[PDB]
Amino acid sequence: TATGFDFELIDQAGLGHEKLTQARNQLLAEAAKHPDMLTSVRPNGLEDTPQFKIDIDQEKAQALGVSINDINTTLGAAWGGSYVNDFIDRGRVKKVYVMSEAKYRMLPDDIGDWYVRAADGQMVPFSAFSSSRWEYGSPRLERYNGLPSMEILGQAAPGKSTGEAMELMEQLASKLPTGVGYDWTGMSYQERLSGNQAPSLYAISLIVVFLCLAALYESWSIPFSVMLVVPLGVIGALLAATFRGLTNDVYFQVGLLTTIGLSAKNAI
Amino acid sequence: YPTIAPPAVTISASYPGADAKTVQDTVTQVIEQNMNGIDNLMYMSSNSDSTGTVQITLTFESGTDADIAQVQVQNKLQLAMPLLPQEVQQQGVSVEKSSSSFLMVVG
Amino acid sequence: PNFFIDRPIFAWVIAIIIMLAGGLAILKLPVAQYPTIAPPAVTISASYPGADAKTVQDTVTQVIEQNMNGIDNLMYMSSNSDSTGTVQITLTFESGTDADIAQVQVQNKLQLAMPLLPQEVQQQGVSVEKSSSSFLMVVGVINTDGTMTQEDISDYVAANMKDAISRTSGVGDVQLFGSQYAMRIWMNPNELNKFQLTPVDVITAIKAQNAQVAAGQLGGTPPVKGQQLNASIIAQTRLTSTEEFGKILLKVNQDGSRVLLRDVAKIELGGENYDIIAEFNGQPASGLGIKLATGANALDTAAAIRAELAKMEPFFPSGLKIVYPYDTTPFVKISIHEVVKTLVEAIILVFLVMYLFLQNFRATLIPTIAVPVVLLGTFAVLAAFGFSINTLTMFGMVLAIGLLVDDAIVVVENVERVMAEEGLPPKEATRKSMGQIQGALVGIAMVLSAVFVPMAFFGGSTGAIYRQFSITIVSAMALSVLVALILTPALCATMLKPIAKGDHGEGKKGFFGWFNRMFEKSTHHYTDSVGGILRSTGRYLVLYLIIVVGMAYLFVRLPSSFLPDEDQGVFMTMVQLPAGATQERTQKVLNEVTHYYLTKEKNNVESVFAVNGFGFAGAGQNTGIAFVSLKDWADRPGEENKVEAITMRATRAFSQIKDAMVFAFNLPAIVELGTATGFDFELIDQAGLGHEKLTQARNQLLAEAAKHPDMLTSVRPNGLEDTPQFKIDIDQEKAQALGVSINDINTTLGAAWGGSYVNDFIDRGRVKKVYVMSEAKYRMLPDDIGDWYVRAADGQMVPFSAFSSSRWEYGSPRLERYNGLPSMEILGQAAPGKSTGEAMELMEQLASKLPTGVGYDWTGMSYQERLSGNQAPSLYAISLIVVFLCLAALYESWSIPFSVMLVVPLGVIGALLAATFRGLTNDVYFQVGLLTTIGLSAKNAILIVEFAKDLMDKEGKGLIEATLDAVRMRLRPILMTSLAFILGVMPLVISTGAGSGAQNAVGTGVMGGMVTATVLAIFFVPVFFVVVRRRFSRKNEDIEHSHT
Amino acid sequence: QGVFMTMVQLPAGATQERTQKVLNEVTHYYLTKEKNNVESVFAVNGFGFAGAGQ
Amino acid sequence: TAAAIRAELAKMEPFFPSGLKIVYPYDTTPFVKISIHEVVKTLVEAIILVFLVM
């Protein structure tokens, strides 16, 4: 994108998901307070969903003759599914999945219809050794470079340069709790080191161009007289950009160059 | 367009039934612990999905011959393959070269 | 050529373009200490916790050495089967064999040996790596208050650092000095016996109790029509604490008194391994052992590593500031910086010589500017030729200042000479000088490639050296030549003020002039002399014979060499205890050494990082090592604050008074790679004679080379002799009826004393390991064998004193292997000034008398010397006939070319004699030096004989007449070029610090070589040309002629 | 590019049913008020960009 | 490959029992050898006949 970024907010210390998300609201609300820089600071991930814990009371089955492995894998093969064997149909190998049927594994109540047949020969209801509670948890556990992390997309105000928003983010994500550090990636990475590099390139460009005109003729001042044609070609391109409502994009940029070219040709 | 975007290899594994913390803990951290010592590494990013499918993409320095990156990756992951669970291990981990530029999609 | 003399601005542009091509090719050009020298190798490492030596050799090592079948460019394969259960297979390759393909072929040949390996091995990680050897750097971590112990610190390293600091773009295997946190469970035998339990129930317990679970989903997919909830089932989860681990239940008792883990074994967050302990200055520390990549630039990898770690510094806890024990980086930095400082200085001195000759400042700037631009320019040919800013090419620079100065100098000189000889204005005079010295400049450039090029034709690491040198010299030289045509002559015509006819200084003003008088008066001296010697020829012929032969004897009784040992500012000492030692006694030795260094070396030494448990070939309680860091150089005056004095007398302090062997040393300049005198003999059994017969063959040999003090030094095998072993030859009979099960007896024996990785747990967020082993005291002295019981089929435990046995044998802790077969390795040297080759042949001849199936072979260092070598005589014969042919071209005579080649010794005998007079060695640098030197002589004499023939031909002047005029015209440049050099070189031999051993090695050969060169040739060359041309006739009986 | 796309997201922990609801709405929408611009609408339930989920 | 391989066998020679002998049933090597020696003889000859013609 042009104006903006791909902020990575990273946990570095032995913290937990809750702590990070807390930091994220902290920064996202503190930086949604600057249209003076950033517009649409938004996190790209999935928020904590309602999740349903079945903290088996391990005691109330530990004698019953039932095996944890059996309880787990029946629970599992019940509501998730299991890849078992492979079969050769019509000529081609395919997978063999065994799962519950639809209706007998959907709503929490259905939990009950499931029975573990213990070692002796007696079944056990699941409401005998289980539990049930409702917590939260992310469905998308993101990580950046080996550590827990969370990704905040966002940009800068319509006519503010991407970099300025970046520096203000540095000074804002500066105000975060210990174990929370900052970092950049992808676009904002590729593009972070490559922005204030351009002037050196014109240093080579225009300096080597001046030495060539110094060569052709034989003067150091004559090339000035010829290099003076440069703006002449530009203010016409800009004027067109601004008046056609276009933008300083690359095709305009190489274009701007070519123009500089002929200015120099004719002037030469 | 020309070959423009910095080359990267994605690794994905499916772990039927795993909630996010499970895919982050049986598979994701095991792999993020065994990608130590491949060449030209710019950065690493994981997705531990509530579908049980983990997507760990590694993005590299520009003009880093992909083929070799994809190999140091597939062969540093085929080290942590025993240190993986058996649902995963049997249903395939997948190391692929990554973009999004599908020439065509045919329904 | 000339096009430019009329356009000075065009030429100035060419100057500045080559200049910023210099600077531009300077900011992004490789910088290493050396060129990449180490032949590529792939190391595979395997872990088999609790395994005896013979076990790592037989369960993992030989299963894989059978699957390393069909790898490319394979030079050799070597196994280290360690009694720590860690086997190290090193495969070394042909030179520069791009790692990636080799390492990929090896890992995809190892994936055949992957199913046929244990579940213990396969689970503790097998490792296929690209890697050097010498630690690129070691980064220690400590704490001020020491409110933490080795385990805490080491954890922070392995939980906050070692996971990503090895994930750069050029690090091989970081080696943790400490170990990462783990869930440590220590079984208590008496109370574990009480409540009726084996380790096996502890295993299955913590396993199936503690885990994540393949749960599933509410609203499961595919749902039913109208379904309106989707949410996640989180079932049984993995753990977190030590509580959650105490509470782990094994069985319920009849009354209610449950048997918890908590009770039955002690449960603690503890290291995954308690073998290695790291003490920085006696203070507890945990380090990072960084080994260099398989051909990555050093200072760039360290820069990147310094970047990630400098990024972790904002999240380190209270007081955890990084400490720095060992870095091979600043040596390279300060070294090359001292060579560049010298580049600057040599320029400076040269300008001074030049003022004292051409007493006009704006004229003296002509060749002053002549160099910085031929320099900059070469760096761009290096960027273009795939080289680096290594020591070799750097010394090629500093070295080549001489040819550049000479070229510029003879041009400005020839102009000026003509401007005082006729009275012409500069410009036409410039055109004129050029009209003579032009062709000569291209011909000398040619004969110059003809001598530096064959030197590029050598093989080996050293071959890489001679080629790096040969190129910066020939390349830089072409560049001085083009400068001599575009820029130089335009400058002589341009900034240089005109001297009208016959001015010749001549005091005239009173400072700079009393000189010109001294000198002109003296050039006469010179001329009246040379005439005086051309008078009598035989005499000088004889003196010449004497000079060659003197060169000869001086040459042969000179000790060859390899490279310089440099006080890199950072050294280390190695520790080894007697058979079967303990962690406490090692730590004892290490504490002592640590104490010594902080006293008798209180002013030179700063930090001692003691590494207990990790030696070289591998680990053990017995072995220790100590990376020790010194103070800044400015507080280290004399020669006694240096590596050799410190390490020698330290070694005195520890050798002569100690029980165990402890040495202090500094590693040579090369990161890894063989040294000089010495070798690496591998003695191999081929027809299967077992460990005993082999090691014994090693003893026969260790004694057979003990009968020749005339040759072989340090009669040593480098390995470890067989240690005391304690066998438990289970009688399976007296347990197969007892109600007891074998599988359970094994894994209990193991989990007791070997240990077991069981599950995985969540520490503060980070996955770490789950280990079960005995408690400390129930496995030390042999008796503890008894305290452990197997809970049989019925319910009765059984004593270990029930089914076992017990005896004590011997067997090695390190089963070394070479080329796929069992082997043992004998290091050694040659007598001092004795060649490695002689000792090598005597070694092939003594181990020749060994039992059938025990054969010999060579590796590593000893390889370097067998396929190659002694190519020099032919290389220089090449150089000499090719050069001779070039002089027959240039001179268009066969008999004339001889006169320049005769000047060859004159420059040598000076270098030799300078070496012998200082104490240096016929090492690489002496050869480069002599290269350069024989060069400059060639330059000068060629010039002289050139003028003479011209003046006889293109003026019809006599033989003698012309000879004298030739010498006459150009004594002044020869001296001034030469004199500029020697003064520029002085800094080298005078240099102290940062590889000043190299510098001293340059400066030496060069200075002496030069003195004898000029100061003899400017008297011998006329006698060369004269007597040689008088074994040639036609026209010149004595000549005169005509004109166009 | 002659072909464009729209992204849809249901509130947290929603179901395949509501998703398929929105998607068929949009498909109809394109074939209606855009009957003359749209040729083909390809609806994907369960896979968006933001991540995986019904 | 043949120089290095027959050298490999000659290093294995101190470990061969009674009669456990090497045989060469099949080798593409000497063909290369004589194929080439015939070409050089030809080349040489071509030269000779050229000098003679000239």
Ligand SMILES: CCCCCCCCCCCCO[C@@H]1O[C@H](CO)[C@@H](O[C@H]2O[C@H](CO)[C@H](O)[C@H](O)[C@H]2O)[C@@H](O)[C@H]1O
């Ligand atoms: C800024 C310093 C520059 C350095 C310049 C130094 C030049 C001064 C050197 C003076 C020494 C001369 O050394 C040289 O040896 C030869 C020997 O054959 C001598 O030559 C003389 O002796 C021999 C025999 O005795 C012959 O008869 C010959 O006729 C006669 O001229 C010397 O007279 C001189 O020509």
